From TrEMBL, chains A, B, C, D:
This is AT3g61540/F2A19_140. The gene is F2A19.140. InterPro entries: AB_hydrolase_1, AB_hydrolase_fold, Peptidase_S33, Serine_prot/Carboxylest_S33. Pfam families: Abhydrolase_1. The keyword Ion transport does not apply.
Length: 448, 448, 448, 448
């Protein structure tokens, strides 16, 4: 089954939507799920025969871009390609596993045994099920992957590379070659997270006292925290999560300072006490995404598993660095408190109200040993499909050593190391990323 | 008293903060208030002498711009001046009246006697208190007003105009010359709101069935609306206020369609009912500002009063148009339901959870009939300060027929009527708005 | 003693020469030396007071840029500073140690005791001697260093750091922290040279056979070679030095392909023997710089020495890599012949006619211990001068691993890593380099 | 017989080489010669049908462009045409007549009887033999020629107008209508050469003494000169030959001044004699091209012959101007000494070491009568092929008055006179030269 809507406009572009009915598990005919994609073109090119580009989104539970106008990489891509934006399984409009949707299962065993079908390998099987129907004569297409969309791209080079014309990857080469790589990722991740904290306080020296005051006030409170507007808790452990975007994203240092300006509430009536501001508690409750995209909490470590369980791998490895990462040791010893990022911890399923009912199913995932494979190293060592990659030298989401060690196992890969961009660099000056990566494959900047 | 911080850097900008201690009520010495402003200059110009520019922010209750990069109108303004961004009284870092802050007052009589000090005719006395201390030799300065910041600028042209070099306005010309203009504003408002709804359903035709089905489900639920995560309710009246920014801001039409794509949850497991999605409820609760900036609800109609009571004028006028604006009538007579904007109603203080304790103080303000005046028409009728205004022809938030009569009383005003921007226009290619406005005063485009 | 010439013109640029009389060695009063510098400004600014910039030239033994028009980085720099181009002592117009000029010394010991005064520390004492006489008020100035000019810049951050406003470096961070780093620099050099040879034959597959047929005819010829026009000899060991400019720079891969097409001359008269072409022998003799800049042979390995000898360290290291770099093993075993990098060898003073008499003085330098030091790590660790550096990821001359660890010993250095450019990146796209490196210090890009 | 190679890449361009067998003399069909042309296109256009363009390099005996990137005129031409670069017979890869290769001929008569086949009429026979099997359908093509390449192009319009779509010329219009025009060319040549020397010493006044001191030293030296590194001799007549490219070409004035700074070696040891520098003698030996392209000396005056001999016409014409061009008279009278233009003299074969053995064959050519035709004026007077020419008003190499008489005989020629450019202009402003000349033919700039 395949159905599609009428064309519609946003300023400078034309858009259309497609819906497919596809197997839950390709080992069976039944049950089915819906999968959704949106096709985009520049004005006046609705019927024109052109090459196709597939975009694969940057994170385990995130949806396709949803543009309001032509800008950035989409505007540029539309100068050459039909652009296809795919809503990955369980997110966006492709059978969504919202915090309300996952309450339909009676028991944690049923939820865990459903969630295992949503992973990188099935995302690639759905992309192949789309191009054989969407593309004229079932021709090959180009793919662009950001972050986790780059991990999907290496699974596509490993299995069914016959559909690929050329591959572009931004900030998205994974480590490969072990039954679970998660321990090597987080052991290196804490070192970049520590260095990004160094840069933040070096730029904004005044904040060291502000976070100190706030960590005391949250810890001296009767529960080790304070209630948020949506019935969750803010605690000194919860405060340390702001780094996930506040340190690793391109506007993060700028925004994190402007939020720490508004922490306390003013005394209007004399004799009233000093208090935490409702504006800060509302802003914190709106900063993260886990209460909205819960697959980014549940399936995060499972992207590294290829034959063994992760067992809450980030939570083990925090104990190797907790002499500097404990907020309570920091305030006692007069050290700055350190923020953390791209890593998840068991206690988040206690403090975040929307995750409360999934505490059991998250452990059944964390303990699963029998994860199927994601990559094929003997094939990648023999690859024929052209590959270009943007590699960021100071990236906290994927470590540079793990990238360059892996790049030796892809046969023909060309890559540019640059220091000039954060992990967000396909959004921030995205136009020149697409020009530079296409230029290598197209032959404008030949082997150098 | 006046205190000044150290400079800090944002990409291509240099920023510094100033804090002033100011009378609550200028009729006496004390109590005091703290007022905050941020001074901005381009790289390398911290010590250079240049003309000053003051920005007056566009809404009751809003903080100033908070820039994370140079690019926008601020980049242009920094080519010639050292832009000053003022957090208005009670709105931002200037002793904010957050929800948690307003709970300090023991009775509705105390809160209502305090909120009356937070109007436009005091925001202009703070601006005069600042320039005599901030500007070299206390020289005159130019002022830029967006929306409600234009209403402040007209009080400045009538009271203490001696400090002004020239005035630039975007939207923001009020009706003047009655004791309460709010009836006249809202009688015009429902006409543009009806028109803009026509255009929305002409552009996205399939949404006519999506809102219908949703209004029926919200009417059939127990006690009407479904409960929101913060303890509010989504009634079909609450669904109609979604159009406030959705129909009147430049990105609003596309963003409102992409929200209506997400309404229901998928039937993942057999026998589970059709159900409203946690994503839609969270997005709805994140859409409006009244919990974040409650001073925008409390003092909205009170900007139109000069010695007469508003008495919930927006709610009186709705009954004149109820034959088309009643959502229950639309689902029975198969007509499209209409959304609304820039109008606040009594029931919001029953239903938006953050506003629940302030209902009594909102009625004491709504029934007040002895406000001081905002304007002085005999002085506007003798004005010598140069004035340039950008006037948007199809503006939802201030009406063209009321602007064009008021523009006859300002003695030397030049104004540029255009269809090509919505009310958000200073944030939508603001570089050309500031160049075109300055070109009319400076003499690049002389009178014709 | 100090003299200066009259201004003269070049398209869009106005030049002027200054000549200084300087001691041969400091801590003594005599003998003297002349040192030459050339001031450059954009049109009409000759009388205008501006900041100064000094350019330190990139090869040991090379004269300054000598421009024919305003172009590249000189066109940019003259928008802001009064660029000074320095002919380093022993080069250009500054006491030139030309291949006939050095024949005035009656013995090899006499010559060797002269050449020891021409290192990087004395180049910084010359630059200090210029500033205090040339610059108004004797103020600080900004220094720019390509390659070995970056080695000079780190001695200027080690000794006399008071003269510096800010430092810019390009492909020029030295290794630091050992008595002689040359064995490491070379252990790493043969690794990158092997990589660049792989890319060359991967791009031009036909050249594998053309260098194997050529190495054979040269090995079969008398003495294993053929006579050059100046009476030197071409041998299979001598042919490998084409890799220096051929593999390490930005036009070398193309220039080296167009030269290898020209190797054999045609049979015009039947029965005439197959012979080596005069265009190839003339272009090979014209390809290197050792006939023109003999100081680039004699002092080259000495730039890595502090209190220990080099002892022909590049020749000592090729013995570890012999099995791939030997050209006669390569033809016997049917493998491609490799070309070599920025290395000097004992035999090079026998093959090249211009170097023949300096063979004895080369050994007296190569075996010399008690070289005075160049760097002061305990001052680099607590530096306060701003420093920016362009660092190239696939550089053949300075190894990335040695650069990135040495950058950790400068207190505030802002390096940017890139793969976009080769070592020549200030000549090609030089505008970008000055805008980006100034932008990291000036404030256009703050720390992230 | 025709062969073609595989494609290869340089930055922004794709290149391929074609090799053809042609007769030595078209009247006998034996012996054979191989001719080489390189085809160039922009990226991704290898297969696409677009019009061909032929380029004629225009130094007698010089190699075609040999590009390493897209820049100048080739970057622009490839926006419209399939560019074909022809190595003219006897140079580049088209069976080279280099020094070592001409030494196969047994006697001067054999050599002279070979060289008479390497002229401009046969270059057109070769170019027509290529079009008929390289171009699809054997269609017409556009041609471009600088200098002697425009010489060639008027013989193409004389003898094979069927193949020409249009003609573009950049200062290659010769004076036709006599049996040998060389006496007219050199009579008008010494006038320009004198006026260019007056501009040089007016721009660089300090050089007047430098050349005088150097002419005295060369004349007083043993045997009337100083020995070059290659075993040639620098005599004072040899020093005057710098002007060939030092005056008439675009950077010549700049370069020639920087070279005259380097003349003398310093005195490092007290009482050493003052001496001519090894840098200067190596630079002078590297300045001229006659060692690299001996066909440029041997077949120079032969381009002006159409039935009468040249008889060393430049050497004879010099006698009319000897009162100012003799360097020995100039020093004795205390006048400036003048550099010479593009011209060749009998003594060059006694002083340039590579030319020494060809002295006899040069005189057999210089005495040859019965040279065949080059032009057909009764066809040029009724030509129908479109022609566009860039004509330079102060050109050293082709005299303007000889162009303006010849341009009256071509029927449809449009020419633009300019003083903006020296003779080199197609390499200095390439882009705008091709845009301006095509603009006359295409109808951008109609008759006016």
């Amino acid at each position: 089954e395949h159905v599609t809507g009428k064309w519609f406009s946003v300023p400078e572009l034309r858009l259309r939507d497609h819906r497919f009915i596809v197997p839950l598990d390709y080992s069976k005919s039944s049950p089915k799920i819906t999968v959704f994609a949106r096709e985009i073109v520049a004005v006046g090119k609705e019927e024109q025969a052109m090459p196709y580009l597939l975009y694969l989104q940057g994170g385990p539970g995130f949806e396709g871009p949803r543009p309001s106008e032509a800008s950035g990489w989409i505007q540029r891509a539309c100068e050459e390609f039909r652009v296809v934006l795919l809503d990955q399984r369980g997110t966006g409009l492709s059978t969504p596993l919202t915090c309300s949707s996952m309450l339909q299962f009676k028991s944690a065993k049923e939820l865990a045994d459903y969630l295992v079908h949503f992973r990188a390998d099935n995302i690639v099987k759905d992309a192949e099920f789309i191009r054989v129907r969407l593309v004229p004569k079932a021709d090959p297409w180009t793919i662009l992957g950001q972050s986790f969309g780059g991990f999907c791209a290496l699974t596509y080079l490993s299995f069914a590379p016959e559909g690929l014309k050329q591959v572009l990857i931004t900030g998205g080469i994974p480590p490969i070659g072990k039954a679970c790589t998660a321990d090597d990722v987080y052991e290196a991740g804490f070192e970049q997270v520590a260095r990004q904290n160094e840069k933040y306080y070096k730029r904004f020296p005044q904040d060291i006292e502000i976070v100190r005051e706030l960590v005391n006030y949250l810890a001296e409170s009767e529960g080790g925290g304070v209630p948020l507007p949506s019935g969750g808790i803010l605690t000194p452990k919860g405060l340390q999560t702001l780094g996930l975007s506040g340190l690793g994203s391109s506007t993060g240092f700028e925004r994190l300072h402007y939020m720490l300006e508004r922490v306390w509430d003013p005394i209007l009536v004399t004799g009233a006490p000093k208090c935490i501001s409702q504006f800060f508690l509302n802003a914190f409750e709106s900063w993260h995404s886990f209460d909205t995209n819960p697959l980014y909490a549940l399936l995060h470590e499972a992207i590294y598993c290829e034959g063994a369980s992760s067992g809450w791998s980030a939570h083990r490895l925090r104990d190797k660095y907790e002499y500097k990462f404990d907020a309570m040791k920091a305030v006692k010893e007069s050290q700055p408190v350190l923020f953390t990022g791209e890593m998840i911890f068991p206690w988040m399923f206690d403090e975040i109200h929307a995750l409360k009912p999934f505490k059991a199913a998250a452990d059944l995932l964390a303990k699963k040993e029998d994860w199927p494979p994601l990559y094929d190293v003997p094939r990648l060592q023999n690859n024929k499909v052209p590959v270009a990659a943007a590699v960021y030298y100071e990236d906290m989401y994927v470590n540079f050593k793990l990238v360059t060690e892996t790049a030796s196992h892809i046969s023909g890969i060309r890559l540019w190391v640059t220091n000039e961009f954060m992990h967000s660099g396909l959004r921030d000056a995205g136009r020149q990323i697409i020009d530079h990566l296409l230029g290598m494959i197209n032959g404008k900047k030949p082997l150098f």
